[PDB]
Amino acid sequence: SMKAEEARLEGKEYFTKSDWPNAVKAYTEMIKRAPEDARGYSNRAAALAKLMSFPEAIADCNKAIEKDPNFVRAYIRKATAQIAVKEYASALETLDAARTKDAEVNNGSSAREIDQLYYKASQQR
């Protein structure tokens, strides 16, 4: 809907200005207005992660994954949150899935980021 789209733009503006709590609020509205749109979940996760609200961020990334399995960013985001909460083994699994999807849908464009997350997860484990 147009109002979901306004909420996504508002979100993006708040996020851009590092106003995390207002981004959370905007993405919650995006999610209410377009509950099947994976971007709202991933986007709210991004803001919750900046707030160090990791269980919530991870739950939203999981929901984004359910709504759009080709949404590579959700996988990368989730792994990053899993590293933050020392779920290393899980992160490495999530990164394996992200690398595969990244090749399939993005033709490798996020490979560098995924490989450095993988390295970081492996070493801390």
Binding site: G11, S42, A46, A47, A49, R73, R77, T80, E113
Partner: peptide
């Protein structure tokens, strides 16, 4: 990187 990006 992803933690700096929104859609």
């Amino acid at each position: 990187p992803t933690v700096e990006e929104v859609d």
